[PDB]
Coordinates of C-alpha atoms and ligand atoms in Angstrom, one line a residue:
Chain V
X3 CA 32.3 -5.8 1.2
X4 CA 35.4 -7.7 -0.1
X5 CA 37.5 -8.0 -2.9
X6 CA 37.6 -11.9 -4.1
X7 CA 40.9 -14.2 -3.7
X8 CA 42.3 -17.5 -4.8
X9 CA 41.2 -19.9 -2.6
X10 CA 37.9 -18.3 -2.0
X11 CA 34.8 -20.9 -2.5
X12 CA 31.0 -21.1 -2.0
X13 CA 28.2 -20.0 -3.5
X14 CA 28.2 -17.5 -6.2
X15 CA 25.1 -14.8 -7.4
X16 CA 26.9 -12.9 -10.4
X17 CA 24.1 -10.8 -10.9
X18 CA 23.6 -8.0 -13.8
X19 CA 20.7 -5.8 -15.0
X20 CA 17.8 -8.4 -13.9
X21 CA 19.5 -11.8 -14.5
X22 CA 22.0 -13.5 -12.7
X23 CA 24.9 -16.1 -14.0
X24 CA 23.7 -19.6 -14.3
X25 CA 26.0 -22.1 -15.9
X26 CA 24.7 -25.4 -17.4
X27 CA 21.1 -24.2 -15.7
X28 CA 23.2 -24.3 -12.1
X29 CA 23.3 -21.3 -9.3
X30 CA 27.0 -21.6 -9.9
X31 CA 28.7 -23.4 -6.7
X32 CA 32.5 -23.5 -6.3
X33 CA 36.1 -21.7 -6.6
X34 CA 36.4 -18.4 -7.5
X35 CA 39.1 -18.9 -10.0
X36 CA 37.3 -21.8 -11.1
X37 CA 34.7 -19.1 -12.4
X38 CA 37.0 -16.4 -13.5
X39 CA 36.1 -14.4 -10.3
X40 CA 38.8 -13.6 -8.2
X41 CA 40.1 -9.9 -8.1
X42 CA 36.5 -8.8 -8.3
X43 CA 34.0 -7.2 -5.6
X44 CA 31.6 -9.2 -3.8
X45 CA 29.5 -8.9 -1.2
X46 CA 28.5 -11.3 1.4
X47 CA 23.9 -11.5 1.4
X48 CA 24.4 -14.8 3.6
X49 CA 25.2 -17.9 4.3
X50 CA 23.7 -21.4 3.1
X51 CA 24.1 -24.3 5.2
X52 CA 27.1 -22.5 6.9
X53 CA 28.7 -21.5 3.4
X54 CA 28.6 -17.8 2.3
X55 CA 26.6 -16.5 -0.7
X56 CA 28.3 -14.0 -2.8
X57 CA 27.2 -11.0 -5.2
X58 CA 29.2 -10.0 -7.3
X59 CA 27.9 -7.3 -9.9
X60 CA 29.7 -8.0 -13.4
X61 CA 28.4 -9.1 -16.7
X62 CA 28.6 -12.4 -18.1
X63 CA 28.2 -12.9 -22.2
X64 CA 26.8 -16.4 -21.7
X65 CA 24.1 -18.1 -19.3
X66 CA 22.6 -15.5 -18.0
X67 CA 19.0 -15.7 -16.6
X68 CA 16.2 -15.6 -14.0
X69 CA 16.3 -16.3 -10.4
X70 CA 12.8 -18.1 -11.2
X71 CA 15.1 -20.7 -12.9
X72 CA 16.6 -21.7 -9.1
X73 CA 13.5 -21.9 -7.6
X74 CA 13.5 -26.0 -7.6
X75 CA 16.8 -25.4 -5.8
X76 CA 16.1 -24.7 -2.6
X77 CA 13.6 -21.9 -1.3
X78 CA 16.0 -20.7 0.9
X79 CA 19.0 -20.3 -1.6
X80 CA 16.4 -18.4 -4.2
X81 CA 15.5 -16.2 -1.2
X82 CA 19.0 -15.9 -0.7
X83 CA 20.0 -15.6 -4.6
X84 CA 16.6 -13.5 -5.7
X85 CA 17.7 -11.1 -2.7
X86 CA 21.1 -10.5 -4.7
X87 CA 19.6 -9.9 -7.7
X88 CA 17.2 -7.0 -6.3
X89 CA 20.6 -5.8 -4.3
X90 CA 22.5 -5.2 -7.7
X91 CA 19.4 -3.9 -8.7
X92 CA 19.3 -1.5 -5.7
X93 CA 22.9 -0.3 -6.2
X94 CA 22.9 0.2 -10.1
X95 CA 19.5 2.9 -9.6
X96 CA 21.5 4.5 -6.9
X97 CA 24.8 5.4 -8.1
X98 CA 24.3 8.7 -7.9
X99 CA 21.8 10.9 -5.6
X100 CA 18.6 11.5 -6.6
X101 CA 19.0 15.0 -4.9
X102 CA 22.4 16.6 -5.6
X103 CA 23.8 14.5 -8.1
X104 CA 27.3 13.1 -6.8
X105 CA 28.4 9.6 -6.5
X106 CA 26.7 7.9 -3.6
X107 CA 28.2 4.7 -1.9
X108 CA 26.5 1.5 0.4
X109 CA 26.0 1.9 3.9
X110 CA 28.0 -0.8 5.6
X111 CA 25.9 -1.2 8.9
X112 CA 22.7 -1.6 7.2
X113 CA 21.3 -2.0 3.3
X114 CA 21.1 1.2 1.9
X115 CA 22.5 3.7 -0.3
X116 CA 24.6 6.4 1.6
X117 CA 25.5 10.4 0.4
X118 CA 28.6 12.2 -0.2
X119 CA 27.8 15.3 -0.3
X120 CA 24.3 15.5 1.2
X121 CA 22.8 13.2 3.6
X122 CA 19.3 11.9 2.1
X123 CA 19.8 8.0 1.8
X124 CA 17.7 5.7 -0.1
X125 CA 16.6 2.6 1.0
X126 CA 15.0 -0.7 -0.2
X127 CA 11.8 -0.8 -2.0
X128 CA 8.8 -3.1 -1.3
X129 CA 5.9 -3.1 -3.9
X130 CA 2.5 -4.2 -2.7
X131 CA 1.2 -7.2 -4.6
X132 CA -2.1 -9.0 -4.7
X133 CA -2.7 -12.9 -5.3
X134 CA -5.9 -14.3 -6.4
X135 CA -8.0 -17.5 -6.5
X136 CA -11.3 -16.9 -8.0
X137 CA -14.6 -19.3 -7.9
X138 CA -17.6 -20.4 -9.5
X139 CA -19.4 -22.6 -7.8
X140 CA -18.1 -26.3 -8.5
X141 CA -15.2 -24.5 -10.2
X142 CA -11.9 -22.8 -10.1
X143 CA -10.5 -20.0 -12.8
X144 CA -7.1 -21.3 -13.8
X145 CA -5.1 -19.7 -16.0
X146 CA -1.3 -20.1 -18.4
X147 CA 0.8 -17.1 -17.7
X148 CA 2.7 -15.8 -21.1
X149 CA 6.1 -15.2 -19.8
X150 CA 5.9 -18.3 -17.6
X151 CA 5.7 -21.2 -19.8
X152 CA 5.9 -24.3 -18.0
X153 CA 2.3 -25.3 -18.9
X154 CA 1.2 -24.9 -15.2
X155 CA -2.2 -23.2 -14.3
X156 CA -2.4 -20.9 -11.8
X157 CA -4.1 -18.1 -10.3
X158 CA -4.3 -14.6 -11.4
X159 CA -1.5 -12.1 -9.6
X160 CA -1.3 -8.1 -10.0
X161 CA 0.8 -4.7 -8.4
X162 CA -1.6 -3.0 -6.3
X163 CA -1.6 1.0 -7.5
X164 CA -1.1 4.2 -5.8
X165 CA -4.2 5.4 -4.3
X166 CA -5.8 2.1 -4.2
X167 CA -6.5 -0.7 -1.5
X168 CA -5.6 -4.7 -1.6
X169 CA -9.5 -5.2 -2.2
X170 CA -9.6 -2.8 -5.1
X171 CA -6.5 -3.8 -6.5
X172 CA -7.9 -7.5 -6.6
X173 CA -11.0 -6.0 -8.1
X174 CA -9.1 -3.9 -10.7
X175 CA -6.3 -6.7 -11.6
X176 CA -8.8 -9.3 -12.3
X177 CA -11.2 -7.1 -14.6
X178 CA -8.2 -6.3 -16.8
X179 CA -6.8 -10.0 -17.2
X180 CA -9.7 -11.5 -17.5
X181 CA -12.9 -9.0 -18.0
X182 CA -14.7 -10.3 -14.8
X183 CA -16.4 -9.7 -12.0
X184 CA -16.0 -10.2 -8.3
X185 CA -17.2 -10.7 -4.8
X186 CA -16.2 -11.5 -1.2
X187 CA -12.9 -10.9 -1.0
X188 CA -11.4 -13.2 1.7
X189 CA -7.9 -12.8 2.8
X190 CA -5.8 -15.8 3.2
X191 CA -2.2 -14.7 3.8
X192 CA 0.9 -12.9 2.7
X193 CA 4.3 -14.1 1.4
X194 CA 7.4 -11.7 0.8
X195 CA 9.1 -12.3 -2.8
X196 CA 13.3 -11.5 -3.5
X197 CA 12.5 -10.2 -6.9
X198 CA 11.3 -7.9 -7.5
X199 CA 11.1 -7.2 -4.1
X200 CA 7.4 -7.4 -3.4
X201 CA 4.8 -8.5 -0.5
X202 CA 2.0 -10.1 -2.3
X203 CA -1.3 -10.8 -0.4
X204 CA -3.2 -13.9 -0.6
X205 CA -6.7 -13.0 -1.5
X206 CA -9.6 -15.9 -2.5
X207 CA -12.5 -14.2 -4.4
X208 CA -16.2 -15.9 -5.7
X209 CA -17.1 -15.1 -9.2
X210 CA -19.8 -12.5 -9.3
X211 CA -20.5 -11.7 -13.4
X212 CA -18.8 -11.7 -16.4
X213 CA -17.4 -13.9 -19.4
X214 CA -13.8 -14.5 -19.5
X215 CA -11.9 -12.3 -21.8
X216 CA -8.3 -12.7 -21.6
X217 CA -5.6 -10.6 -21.8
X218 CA -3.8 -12.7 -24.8
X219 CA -0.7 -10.6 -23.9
X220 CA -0.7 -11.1 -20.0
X221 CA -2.8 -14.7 -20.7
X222 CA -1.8 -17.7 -22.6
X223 CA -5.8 -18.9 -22.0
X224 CA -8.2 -18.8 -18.8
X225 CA -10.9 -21.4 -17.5
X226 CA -13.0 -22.8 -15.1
X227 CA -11.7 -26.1 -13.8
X228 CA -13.6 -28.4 -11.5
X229 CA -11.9 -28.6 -7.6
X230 CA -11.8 -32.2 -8.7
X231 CA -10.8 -32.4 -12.3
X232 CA -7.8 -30.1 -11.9
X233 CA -4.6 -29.3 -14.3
X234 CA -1.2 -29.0 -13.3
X235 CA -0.6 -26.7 -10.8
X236 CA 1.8 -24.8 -9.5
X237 CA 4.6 -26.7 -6.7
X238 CA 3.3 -27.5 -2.9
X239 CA 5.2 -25.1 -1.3
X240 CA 4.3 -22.2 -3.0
X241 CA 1.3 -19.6 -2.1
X242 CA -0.7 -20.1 -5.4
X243 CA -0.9 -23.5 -4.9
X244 CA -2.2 -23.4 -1.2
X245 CA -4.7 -21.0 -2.3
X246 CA -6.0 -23.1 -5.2
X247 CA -5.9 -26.0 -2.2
X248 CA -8.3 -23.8 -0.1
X249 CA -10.3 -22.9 -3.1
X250 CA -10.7 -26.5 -3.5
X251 CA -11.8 -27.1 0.2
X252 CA -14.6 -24.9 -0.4
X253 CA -15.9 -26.4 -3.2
X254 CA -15.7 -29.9 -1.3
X255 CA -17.4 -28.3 1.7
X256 CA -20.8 -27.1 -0.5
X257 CA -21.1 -29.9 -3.3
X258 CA -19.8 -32.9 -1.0
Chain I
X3 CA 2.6 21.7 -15.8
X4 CA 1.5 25.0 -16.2
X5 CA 3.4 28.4 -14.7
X6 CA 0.7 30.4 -12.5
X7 CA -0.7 33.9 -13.8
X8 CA -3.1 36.9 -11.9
X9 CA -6.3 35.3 -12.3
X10 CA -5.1 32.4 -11.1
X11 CA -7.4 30.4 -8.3
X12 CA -8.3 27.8 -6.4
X13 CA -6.3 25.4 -3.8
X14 CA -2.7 25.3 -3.3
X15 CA -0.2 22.5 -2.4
X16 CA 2.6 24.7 -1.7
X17 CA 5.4 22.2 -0.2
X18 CA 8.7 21.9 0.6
X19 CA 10.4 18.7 2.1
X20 CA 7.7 17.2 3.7
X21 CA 5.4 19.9 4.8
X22 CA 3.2 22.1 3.1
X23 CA 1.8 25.8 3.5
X24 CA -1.2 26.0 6.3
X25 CA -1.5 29.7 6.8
X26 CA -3.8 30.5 9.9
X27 CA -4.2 27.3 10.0
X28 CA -5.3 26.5 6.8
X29 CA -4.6 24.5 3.5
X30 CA -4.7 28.0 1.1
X31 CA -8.0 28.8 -1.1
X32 CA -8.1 31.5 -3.2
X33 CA -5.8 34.0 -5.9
X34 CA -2.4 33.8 -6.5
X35 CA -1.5 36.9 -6.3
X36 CA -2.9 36.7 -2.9
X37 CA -0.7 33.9 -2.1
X38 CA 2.6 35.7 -3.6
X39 CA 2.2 32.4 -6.3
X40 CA 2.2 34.2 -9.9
X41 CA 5.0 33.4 -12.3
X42 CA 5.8 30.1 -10.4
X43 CA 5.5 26.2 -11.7
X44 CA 2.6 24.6 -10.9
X45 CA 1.1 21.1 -11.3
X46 CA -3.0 20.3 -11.3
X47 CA -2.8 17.2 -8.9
X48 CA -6.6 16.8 -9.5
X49 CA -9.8 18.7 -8.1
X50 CA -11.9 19.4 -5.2
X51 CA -15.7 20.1 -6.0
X52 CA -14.7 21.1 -9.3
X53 CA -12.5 23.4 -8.5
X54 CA -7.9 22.8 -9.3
X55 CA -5.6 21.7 -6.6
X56 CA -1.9 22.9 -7.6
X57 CA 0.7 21.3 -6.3
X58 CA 4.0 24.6 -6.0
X59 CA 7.1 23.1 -5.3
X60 CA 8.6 26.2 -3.2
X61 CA 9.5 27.3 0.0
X62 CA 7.9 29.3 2.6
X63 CA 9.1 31.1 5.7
X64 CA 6.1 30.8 7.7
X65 CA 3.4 28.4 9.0
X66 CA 5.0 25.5 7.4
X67 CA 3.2 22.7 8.6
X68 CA 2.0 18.8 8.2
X69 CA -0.1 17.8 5.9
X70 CA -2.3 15.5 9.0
X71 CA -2.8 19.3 10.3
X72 CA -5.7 19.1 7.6
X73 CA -6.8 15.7 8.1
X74 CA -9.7 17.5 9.7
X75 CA -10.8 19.2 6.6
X76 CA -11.8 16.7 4.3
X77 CA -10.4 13.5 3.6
X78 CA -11.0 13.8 0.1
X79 CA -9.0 17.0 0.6
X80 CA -6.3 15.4 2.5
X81 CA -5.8 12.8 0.1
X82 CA -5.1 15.2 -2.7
X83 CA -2.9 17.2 -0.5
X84 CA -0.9 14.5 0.9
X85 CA -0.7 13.3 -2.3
X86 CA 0.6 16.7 -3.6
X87 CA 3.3 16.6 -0.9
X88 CA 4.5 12.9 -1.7
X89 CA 4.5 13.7 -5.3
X90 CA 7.1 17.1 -4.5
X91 CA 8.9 14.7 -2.4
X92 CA 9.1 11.9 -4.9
X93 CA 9.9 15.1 -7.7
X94 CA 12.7 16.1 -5.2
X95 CA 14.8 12.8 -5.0
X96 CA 14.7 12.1 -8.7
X97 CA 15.9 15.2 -9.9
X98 CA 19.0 13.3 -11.3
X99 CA 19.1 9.8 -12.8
X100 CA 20.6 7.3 -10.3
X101 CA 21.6 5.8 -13.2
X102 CA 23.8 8.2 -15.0
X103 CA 24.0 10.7 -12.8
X104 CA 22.1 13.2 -15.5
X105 CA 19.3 15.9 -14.7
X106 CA 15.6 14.0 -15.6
X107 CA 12.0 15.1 -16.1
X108 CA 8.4 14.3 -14.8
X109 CA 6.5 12.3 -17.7
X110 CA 3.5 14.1 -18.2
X111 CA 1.8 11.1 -19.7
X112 CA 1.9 9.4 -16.2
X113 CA 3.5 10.1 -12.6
X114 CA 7.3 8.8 -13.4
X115 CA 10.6 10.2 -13.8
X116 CA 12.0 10.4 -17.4
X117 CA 15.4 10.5 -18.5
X118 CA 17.2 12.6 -21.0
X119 CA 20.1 10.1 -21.4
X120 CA 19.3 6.9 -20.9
X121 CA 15.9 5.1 -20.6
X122 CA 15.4 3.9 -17.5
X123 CA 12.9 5.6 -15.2
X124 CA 11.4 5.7 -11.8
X125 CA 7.8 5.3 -10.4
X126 CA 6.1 6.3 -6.7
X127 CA 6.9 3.8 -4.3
X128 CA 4.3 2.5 -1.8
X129 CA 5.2 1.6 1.8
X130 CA 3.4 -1.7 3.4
X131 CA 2.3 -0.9 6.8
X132 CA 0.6 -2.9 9.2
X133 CA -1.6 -1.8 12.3
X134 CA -3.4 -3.2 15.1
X135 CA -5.5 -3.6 17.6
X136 CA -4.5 -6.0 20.4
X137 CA -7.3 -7.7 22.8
X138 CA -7.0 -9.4 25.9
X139 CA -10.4 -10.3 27.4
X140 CA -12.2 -7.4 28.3
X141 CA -9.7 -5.1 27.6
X142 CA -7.9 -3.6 24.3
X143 CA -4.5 -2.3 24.1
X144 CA -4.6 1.6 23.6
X145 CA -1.7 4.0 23.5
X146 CA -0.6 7.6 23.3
X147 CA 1.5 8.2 20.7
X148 CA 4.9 10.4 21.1
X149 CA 4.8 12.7 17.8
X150 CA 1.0 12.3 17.8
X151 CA -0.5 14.5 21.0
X152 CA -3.8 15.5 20.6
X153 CA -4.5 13.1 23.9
X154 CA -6.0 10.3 21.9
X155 CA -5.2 7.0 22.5
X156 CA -5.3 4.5 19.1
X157 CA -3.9 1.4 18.0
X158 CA 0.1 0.5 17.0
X159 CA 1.4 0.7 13.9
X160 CA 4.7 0.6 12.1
X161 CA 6.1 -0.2 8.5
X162 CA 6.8 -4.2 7.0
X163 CA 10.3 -4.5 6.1
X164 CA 11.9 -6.6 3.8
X165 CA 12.1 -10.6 3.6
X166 CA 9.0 -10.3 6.6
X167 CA 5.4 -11.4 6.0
X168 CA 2.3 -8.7 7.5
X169 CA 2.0 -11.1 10.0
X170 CA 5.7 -11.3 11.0
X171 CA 5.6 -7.1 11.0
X172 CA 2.7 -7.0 13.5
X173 CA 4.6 -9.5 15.5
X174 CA 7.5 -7.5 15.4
X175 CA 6.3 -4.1 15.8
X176 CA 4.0 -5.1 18.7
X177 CA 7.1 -6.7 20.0
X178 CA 9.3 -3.3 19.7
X179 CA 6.4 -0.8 20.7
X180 CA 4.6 -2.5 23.4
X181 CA 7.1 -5.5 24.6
X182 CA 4.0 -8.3 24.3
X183 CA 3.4 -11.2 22.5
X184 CA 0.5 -11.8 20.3
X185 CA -1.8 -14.9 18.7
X186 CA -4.4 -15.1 16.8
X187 CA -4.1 -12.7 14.3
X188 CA -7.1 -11.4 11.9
X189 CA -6.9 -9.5 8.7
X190 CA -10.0 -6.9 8.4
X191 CA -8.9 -4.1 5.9
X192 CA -6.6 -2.0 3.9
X193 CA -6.4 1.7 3.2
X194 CA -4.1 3.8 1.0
X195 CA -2.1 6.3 2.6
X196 CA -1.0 9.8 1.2
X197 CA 1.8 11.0 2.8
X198 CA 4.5 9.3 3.2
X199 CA 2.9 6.8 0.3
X200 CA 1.6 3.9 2.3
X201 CA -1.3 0.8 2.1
X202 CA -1.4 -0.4 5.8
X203 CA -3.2 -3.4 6.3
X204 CA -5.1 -3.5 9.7
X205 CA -5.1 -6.5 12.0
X206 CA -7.1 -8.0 15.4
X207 CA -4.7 -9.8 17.4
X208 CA -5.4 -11.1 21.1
X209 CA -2.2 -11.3 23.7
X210 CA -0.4 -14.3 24.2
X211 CA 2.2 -13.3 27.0
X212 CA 4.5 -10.2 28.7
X213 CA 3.7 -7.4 30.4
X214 CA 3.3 -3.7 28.6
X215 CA 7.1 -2.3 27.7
X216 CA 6.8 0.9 26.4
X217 CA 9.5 2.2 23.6
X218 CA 9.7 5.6 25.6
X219 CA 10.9 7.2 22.5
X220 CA 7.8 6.3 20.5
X221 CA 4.9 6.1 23.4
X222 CA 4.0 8.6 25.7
X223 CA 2.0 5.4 27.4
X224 CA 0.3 2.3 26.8
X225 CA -2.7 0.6 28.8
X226 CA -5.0 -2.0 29.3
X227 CA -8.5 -0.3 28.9
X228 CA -12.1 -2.1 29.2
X229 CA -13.9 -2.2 25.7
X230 CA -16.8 -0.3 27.6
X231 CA -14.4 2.3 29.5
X232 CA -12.8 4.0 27.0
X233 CA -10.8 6.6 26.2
X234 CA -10.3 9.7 23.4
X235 CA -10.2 7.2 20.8
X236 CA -9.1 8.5 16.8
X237 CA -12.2 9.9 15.3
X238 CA -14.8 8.1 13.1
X239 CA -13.7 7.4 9.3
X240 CA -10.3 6.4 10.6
X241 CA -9.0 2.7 9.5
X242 CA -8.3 2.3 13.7
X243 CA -11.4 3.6 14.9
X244 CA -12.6 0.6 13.1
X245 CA -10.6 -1.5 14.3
X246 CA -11.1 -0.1 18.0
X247 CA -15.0 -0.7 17.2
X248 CA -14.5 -4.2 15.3
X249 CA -12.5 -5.1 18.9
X250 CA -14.9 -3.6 21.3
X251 CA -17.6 -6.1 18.9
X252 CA -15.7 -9.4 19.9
X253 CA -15.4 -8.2 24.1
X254 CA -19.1 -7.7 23.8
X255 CA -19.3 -11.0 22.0
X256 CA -18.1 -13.1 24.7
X257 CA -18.9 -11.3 28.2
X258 CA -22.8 -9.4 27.5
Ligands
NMN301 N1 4.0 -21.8 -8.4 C1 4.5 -20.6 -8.6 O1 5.2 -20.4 -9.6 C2 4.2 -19.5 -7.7 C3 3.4 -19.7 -6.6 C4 3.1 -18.7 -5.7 C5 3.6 -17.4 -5.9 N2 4.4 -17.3 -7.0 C6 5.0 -16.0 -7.3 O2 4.5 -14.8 -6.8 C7 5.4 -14.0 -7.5 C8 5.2 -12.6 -7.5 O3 6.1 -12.1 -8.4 P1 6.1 -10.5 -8.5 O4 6.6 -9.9 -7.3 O5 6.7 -10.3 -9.8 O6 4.6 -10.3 -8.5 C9 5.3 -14.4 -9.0 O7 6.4 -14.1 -9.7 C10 5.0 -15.9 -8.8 O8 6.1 -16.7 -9.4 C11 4.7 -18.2 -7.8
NMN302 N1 -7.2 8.5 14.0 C1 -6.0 8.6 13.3 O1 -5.3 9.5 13.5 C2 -5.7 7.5 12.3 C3 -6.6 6.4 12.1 C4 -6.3 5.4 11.2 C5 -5.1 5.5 10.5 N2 -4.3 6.5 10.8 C6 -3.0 6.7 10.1 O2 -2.4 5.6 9.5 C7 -1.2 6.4 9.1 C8 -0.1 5.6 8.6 O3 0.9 6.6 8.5 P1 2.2 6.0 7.9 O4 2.0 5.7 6.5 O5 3.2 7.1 8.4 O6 2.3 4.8 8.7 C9 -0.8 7.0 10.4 O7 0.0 8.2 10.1 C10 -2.1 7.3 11.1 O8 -2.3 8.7 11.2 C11 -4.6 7.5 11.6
ZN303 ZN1 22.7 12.9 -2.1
ZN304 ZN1 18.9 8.0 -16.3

């Protein structure tokens, strides 16, 4: 925890209330009084290639937006940036104590929120999340996403609920996006995301019964593509995309 | 919400900062005015065999106790009474806004915390977990827990933490606990925990390398035990009696 100076350089995460400061689309990269930053507070998440990554919590009027517009930056960075965002995130629901009510402060040793005048902490937040690829027979259910818009298809994705396991939450998340049904549930891996700070799990799923019925506000449109007449998919390198890749490796393995 | 009168009956959550009320022993059934209850607040966290469980946020002198001291009395029980103690606990540290520092209140449409100033609210937070079962030829890895001592031995577990995958955790954990290195790992299941709010995710893994390292401070002892000579294990209907049994399956698989 710093206060910024003249000469001070790198990269920058100036992150308010779910968005974070990208200039000319850019994860801003420079002098801080190049970017009207110096006397301000910022805190050191990292380093990329040896250079330090900065949050700083103020507002910007202009250019704000979301990390998942750095993602074709570098993974590593939009861990690195995403992970700021969720930390401004952490410290603006934890001013004050939960508990007591008086102004609470970071810990400096590790990542959480430290008391004054009591001595319950809070500390970072993971939420469960499930991933799923779902097929029928020589067939994969692809789907647009609303909110994204980049006319990708990919595969259906939910927050498993209190009370409820990964299985169940698979179960529950696809009936409600797309009115269907279905069977053997095979896990296939977990991936951690920055924000919001989640753990989702890699689940591929066979279509048991049911007509699609999408959710026209979580779904643009759903269908059943063939494992070798695809659409655009989502980037190599991300989970969705491996698990529409093993999706289509089963459908190779029974029809060729 | 409802505040408790004289005719008042049925099971009672009555917890305070992590533990509830176990009178002789046992989670309380019967009148209020038995239980010194009447005129208090008191929330319906659901039923058991048709009959209110209230969840009464106050303190006891006596026989204050954990809530897996009634594990053993019905799970279905258990559930609502862990999740009766999580939902005081979660009631507790969201008393103020971490916001705006200003007193809230529960939503009685669903289980948040609603504001009286500003808008923003908070939800029940649930804890990824993994656990495992470690094999190494004809033996599995079985432990006695510290805080646990009913002179069973189970399987290790600990909590995923942030930026880490499940499989990274059980790496990690199984590094910590035990001092060994594993391969191989499995996914079999998930389960929902009560108290604190938890989905662990259960694992096989089979040992790579190291000898047994016991954290001291978190097991009594850890051994090597043959999937045929075995120990107190954790009753039946637990997630790692499963996996104990799912283990014990692949020894017998390769050497009978
Ligand atoms: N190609 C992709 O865009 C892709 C692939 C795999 C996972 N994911 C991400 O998994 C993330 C999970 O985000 P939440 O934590 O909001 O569920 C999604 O936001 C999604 O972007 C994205
Ligand atoms: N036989 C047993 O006692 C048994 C079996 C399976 C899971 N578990 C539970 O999984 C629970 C996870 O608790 P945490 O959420 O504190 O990790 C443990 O407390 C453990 O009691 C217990
Ligand atoms: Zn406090
Ligand atoms: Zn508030």
């Amino acid at each position: 925890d710093r206060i910024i100076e003249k000469l001070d350089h790198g990269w920058w995460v100036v992150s308010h209330e779910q968005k974070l400061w990208l200039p000319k689309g850019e994860l801003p990269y420079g002098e801080a009084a190049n970017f009207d930053l110096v006397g301000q507070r910022a805190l050191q998440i990292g380093e990329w290639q040896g250079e330090p990554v900065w949050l700083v919590q103020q507002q910007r009027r202009h250019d704000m937006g979301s990390v998942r517009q750095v993602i074709d930056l570098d993974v590593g960075l939009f861990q690195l940036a995403g992970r700021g965002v969720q930390l401004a995130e952490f410290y603006r629901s934890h001013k004050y104590c939960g508990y007591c009510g008086h102004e609470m402060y970071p810990s400096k040793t590790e990542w959480a929120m430290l008391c004054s005048h009591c001595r319950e902490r809070y500390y970072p937040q993971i939420a469960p999340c499930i991933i799923v690829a779902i097929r029928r027979d020589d067939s994969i259910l692809l789907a647009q996403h609303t909110r994204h818009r980049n006319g990708v298809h990919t595969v259906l994705a939910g927050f498993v609920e209190v009370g409820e396991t990964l299985e169940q939450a698979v179960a529950r998340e696809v009936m409600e996006e797309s009115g269907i049904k279905v069977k053997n549930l095979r896990y296939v891996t977990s991936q951690p995301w920055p924000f919001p700070q989640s753990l989702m799990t890699a689940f591929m799923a066979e279509y048991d019964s049911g007509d699609i019925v999408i959710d026209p506000k979580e779904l643009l449109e759903a269908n059943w593509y063939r494992y070798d007449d695809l659409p655009l998919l989502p980037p190599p390198g991300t989970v969705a995309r491996r698990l529409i890749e093993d999706t289509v490796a089963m459908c190779r393995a029974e029809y060729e």
